[model samples]
Target chain A: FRKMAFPSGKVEGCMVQVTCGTTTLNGLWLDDVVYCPRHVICTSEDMLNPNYEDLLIRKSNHNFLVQAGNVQLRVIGHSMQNCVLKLRVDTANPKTPKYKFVRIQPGQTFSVLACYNGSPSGVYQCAMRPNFTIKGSFLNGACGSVGFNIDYDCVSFCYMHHMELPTGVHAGTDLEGNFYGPFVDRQTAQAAGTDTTITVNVLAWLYAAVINGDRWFLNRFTTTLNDFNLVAMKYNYEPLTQDHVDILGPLSAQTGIAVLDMCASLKELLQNGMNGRTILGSALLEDEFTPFDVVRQCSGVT
Target chain B: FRKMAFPSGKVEGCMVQVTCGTTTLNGLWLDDVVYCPRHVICTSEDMLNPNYEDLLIRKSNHNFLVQAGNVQLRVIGHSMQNCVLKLRVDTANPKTPKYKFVRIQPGQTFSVLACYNGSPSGVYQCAMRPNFTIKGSFLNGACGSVGFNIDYDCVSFCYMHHMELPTGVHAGTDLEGNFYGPFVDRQTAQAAGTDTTITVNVLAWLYAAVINGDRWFLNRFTTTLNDFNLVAMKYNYEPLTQDHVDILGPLSAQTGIAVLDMCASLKELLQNGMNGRTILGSALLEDEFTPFDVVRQCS
Candidate 1:
């Protein structure tokens, strides 16, 4: 149930993707999508041949980050010869495939970015398949298709869970335990990268938490992502630093605040990542959460 | 002749485009495209009445830098109601105006980036016109247009040129002089946070010099810009440090370099900003130019 954001925006860098597992959804890998690129030759025109270099694209060649809720396919036909582009999810039947035709001559390029939605009745899974594949052919290689790899890099920052959700569900659970992952603090992940962690199934985590309740991620729900019901147990999502756990953690336990104020506080945290703003500023949040801050400061720990 | 890179990558900061000329091509201002934002109210729907708010946008909302060769119009219909959009050049004839309808409901948005060629028999001019303007109205007071004003703030960075372009021709001549600007350097412009600069213009300058004549700005360009063209210059264009000036500045002066080299250099420089990659790195352009670097450690 976990997923990665679109590889749009500035390209941080590149990685070589070595096949790590067979479990996949659509055309995306269920785990380990980042890797150093390895080059292979196109051996056959027939479908499913290793000869045809299969690049698990980890980056968008045209710099299109499909952030908005939808699929955005941007093709750069910067080639001397014409080329046909093909894309399909892991479960897609080759008989009927997702494809696009781009007519571009040398020195000229074109692109397209679109948004749409497709939902499912359940969490589907596949035993083995290329989550998706991008195929193209031109004597001079294909536009945006050359050296393509799946950009599975995660933004260094993500919101972490602190209290149990309104569902009374522990930090992590699901529609059942079938699709579940460990819900750890952002501190752990940040630390792991620095010298400190996800084998966590965020896909399943999100599905169980928000999908069945709203399916907002699917873009099927009408409520804007911001309009979701705020859970009292949730903490403000920001780049967690050591000070966060050291400051907010025990403070929550020390004062052992009342449920009413906690609920009020969670409502304010809901606007954490909207637009270009973040409630990460200690001073800002401190001013907003008087009871929480008062308790923390009264506890004698700055 | 000068422009700002797409504000795309990431927001460095904002600049107030306080004062700069209004002559623009494809919605972008000549010297004040990068700047801080100012707000205004949308009072009406009539044409110039301010009924509908107008945003003389300097940077892309997403920070996407709109470079040479094309026009990129990025709008965030943050308004709850639907908003209509419009864009016009030097002379926006109401009859044949440039406009696009974006079906945006609250919390939804859209954008477009296109590049085209608009050539005229002359360097166009106008008293006042919005080369680029974003207008809209929403049931909820208006789309993101409810409170919008042309954010004409300019960064202090600007490239003022003491010397005029080597036009070698006349038709473009007018106003006879006052208010003329010196085409400055990128570093200086970047530092000033006012106008804009083009390294290729420097490339063009060298060509104007070695090819036609006039290379005095070498040191002046350096003092104004850092004069280093630095090795990074070698990144996409040519190594433009003092050595490069001493080298090619004179090689062209000695062999007096052929017009062919000048033409070739100009052609190469043309593709400078088109792609994500520039011809700056040393390895890429080595084989193309020799004596200029072969000796003196070619350092």
Candidate 2:
């Protein structure tokens, strides 16, 4: 099981949600809890309609990559009429569904960002749901699975050379993987302009990985989702670049010798979309991982 | 006022926000009203001094921008704890505080976007306060503000490039001016992290703007904050490089323009910061004089 640090301090972006799933065990899905928004045409009285927009949402993809420390997750988007898009947040603990409600108006959107001091790897998922203004329009056009990775790899250069430092996670067999948002449409994707390069080396950490053992992707209990995971893995680019080369040394500077390779083979592994725990295991077992820098140096290869 | 337009289809990188100031209706901050957050503290049997931390907050800034269409606002930045951060949404007229509670726990954050196929701009403010917490930490040692901004500026590219977009407002002045929070020390900030940022920003918005207006920073503003009109002005940037590129051409196109310059100018004017706005006028005002954008062209 994965462990996560809770905020004993104070929280900025958090929510509590109620949904249409089989079991509302803290977590729910878009499909499970999805229903068309309907306006109550009303009876000569109180509210015209119960005032709830089903909340229709459309995004380029399902997963949003947050860097190690590039910047906080400042979000902006829009919704339908008389609707309040409820936002749900969860700490990627793989345990309880950290659902929280953040209301968004019909024509006005709001934002919530996390500071870069703590868990750079803390992955959070945001799903926009129905608030008040429960109308049929929002129901038919609801936006689900709004997840972003907050990686702060570029923290060092936050207000410096304008570089963003950040880092980043996911689902299935996992209790929260109920609604697998549609597979990215390649044809429509191309016609609509997409950065296909970002889709490199997706990996999936399926349900069995959680129930039995943690498989990188496709371990014994995993389904084929390397491409899926690679596509889904929010590749939060750590903002450590050539600009700071002179000022810094190999990551080894931070350690006695366990110098981490910024550019190791995984960048390549990701390129090929390696799935299942078998490949991930081999890579993890051989701990002779290449430094991120070495691999990043070849980013120009593609 | 200025007008911002998205592509025919989906416009990626769009964000939004809604906020108000302290001094409303002759400095009658919206204190203790139907839509205000009430701190109903249930302290231990012999509770005294009042554990404000344990008290519940209603105006903790938990609201969303429209959820569909091209226009959207994602909530960004640090916030308070235990308080129910909600969006006071009213499905009518587009410009009213439709308050509703969405319970937010410790160390949580999110982005509330208003995605509309059209321009969904009017009046919206994120109401924040507190929801009682059972924890002892909040019982003491802290101060905070309750507000958030909605943004959609993602550093990297995304699939939104291929989806339907909205006419967006950068919800820049959700809670204008400066505010403060509990941790005055960076060490506390280092420890709390996201919590600190949210907490600090909330407090910052209060001290810098709300308190100056003589209103409650995070409580119900029935009288004070509920009245203050925090206005937002827009200023587009035109590079000093502008010369003979056709004097009457679109001020934002061709070469480049920056919102930072305008936002800075207006900010200065708001605080009587400098002589920037004096030289500039209504020429660059958008319908909702929100913060100006730093305009740039691909060329």
Candidate 3:
């Protein structure tokens, strides 16, 4: 029943609605495909590939076996046969890696902390190395092997421009005076009508940071893009499909500024610097916001 | 019996303790003395100087028959004979003065606000002028007469340098940025470590303004002097007796710093530029603390 929840060509594996008579249940769907554990035994399902059975078991057992936390990545395994787990960042050249192999046994979990891509633009990947025996008989028989990975880009998380400050003295650590010392300089830069596409992005990032802790990213699905929608609205541009209301909604109740209302004004001054170029979902690793640049975008201080 | 309660030379009248035949009764004593009012009637008591009877009744009637509120003066009269009341202030100077005369009748009291001896240092004085007859028959028969005055000093109240901040822009109206601006170049004056004697008084004045509103004067009795005690303690200099705990006590509980404890640390950085000089309770009315000077002093 769970295996039928997702069909092929979904582009990404995600949960979808499926019913068992009158009961609605949520289960893992891999590649737009799901297998109902209630209707058929998970052990008897057709493998998408030889390792599909193991991947299916891993999906049904945990909502997400992979998680990304600040500069750290974690993985938990469940019901896997004898296998070797290999971890790496996709952005790195795949040669001369160190200590990436771990032997995982059935019903036990394996994990690695601070396992990162090491590059400013890499995503974490964990996979089961093939060539493990199945029941001490056949080699490479899929017996529920499990693997997981996560994404944590340093440049995407607002740590780019802050790289040169003293170690541990990044954007969050800098005090108020240092942040606004050359207040006029920032104001003048804003009024000059230059490339502030990233400037407005920082506004969205700050709003998102206040709502969510400093987990920043400039990407197609990045939550900060919600702020750009309002920024776009000020220019009478088309509305974006996604926004970060769950993050900004509660704050709106407390601050008395409706989330949409404040975002509309926020977008105004920010989009003014955008020229006419449409905003994209990503930025280069070196692109980031400065505290001086951020203040002008906020309240249109210029 | 009440006459024994007042011996000569107290110079000013104040409330005091007295006993009569195992019973403590209140009465009024004259010539700068005090007695409980329970013993004799204030309205009909014999006048100390013939006219003292009128003074006794006036004293007994109202709690603050004489009060000094900043620049304003107030008086309450009770059962008085026809006479004119005059008010003035002076540390000492009596050559030329006027605009001080008000007619009064029996059972009537009148007040004149802002009536003072315009001198920089002065205390208010009220007296009865004997031009009007008592009943048209008895000329100056001391049926009753009343006179009282109080001390008010602008310097003591910390209104000194504030006199120059443009009309209507001093003390209360200046916004936060203006207050902290270097309008007077106090920063450079401080960099040289020269004269901040006037600077410290602003701190004192701010403290006093927090305590008594506009009741400013530069003296040991002035509330601002209490702040000086802390300013001195920070300098390692001998401190004066007055302290601002009485003024800052309520804010202390809320702010979580004890009065003396808060003052001790206040003197640390501020006394650095203070060089070495006893903080005087009085500063030239022209001297004051600036925001830049204040920020340096506060931390």
Please give the CA lDDT of all the candidate structures: 0.21, 0.21, 0.23
TM-score order of candidates, top first: 1, 2, 3
Candidate 2, position A139, lDDT: 11
Worst 10 residues of 1 chain B by lDDT: B120-129
lDDT tens digits by residue: candidate 3, B4-95? 00010111111122222332221122322121222122222231223434443555333322222222222223332122111122211221
DockQ: the better of candidates 2 and 3 = 2
* Residue B27 displacement in candidate 3 (angstroms): 66
Model 3 docking grade: incorrect
* Each prediction's DockQ against the real complex: 0.02, 0.01, 0.00
Candidate 1 lDDT over B1-299, as tens digits, reads 00101111111111111111321222112222321111111212322332223333433334322222233333332111112122212322222212222221111111111101111100000110011111110011111111100111222211111111222100010111111122221112211112212232234334433332333222211222232343334444333344434434544554354323443444443435323222221111212122321211111
lDDT accuracy of residue B123 in candidate 3? 13
Worst 10 residues of 3 chain B by lDDT: B1-10
The runs of at least 3 residues in candidate 1 whose Cα sits more than 4 Å from the true structure, single-residue gaps closed, are A1-302, B1-37, B42-299
Candidate 2 chain B has its poorest 10 consecutive residues by lDDT at B156-165
Residue A51, candidate 1: alpha-carbon lDDT: 24
Q: Taking the tens digit of each residue's C-alpha lDDT, what string does model 2 give over B1-299?
A: 01112111111112222222221000001111111111112224312343444432322333222231333333332232322122333222232222222333222222221222222111112211111111111101011112222233211111010011111111111121111222111111111122111221121222222212222112321221111112221221112112212321333232232222222333333344222221111211211111111121000
Which digits, one per residue and each the tens of the lDDT, describe model 2 over residues A186-256?
A: 11221111212211111111121222233233221222233333423444322222422222243324321
Highest lDDT model number: 3
True contacts kept of each: 0.04, 0.00, 0.00
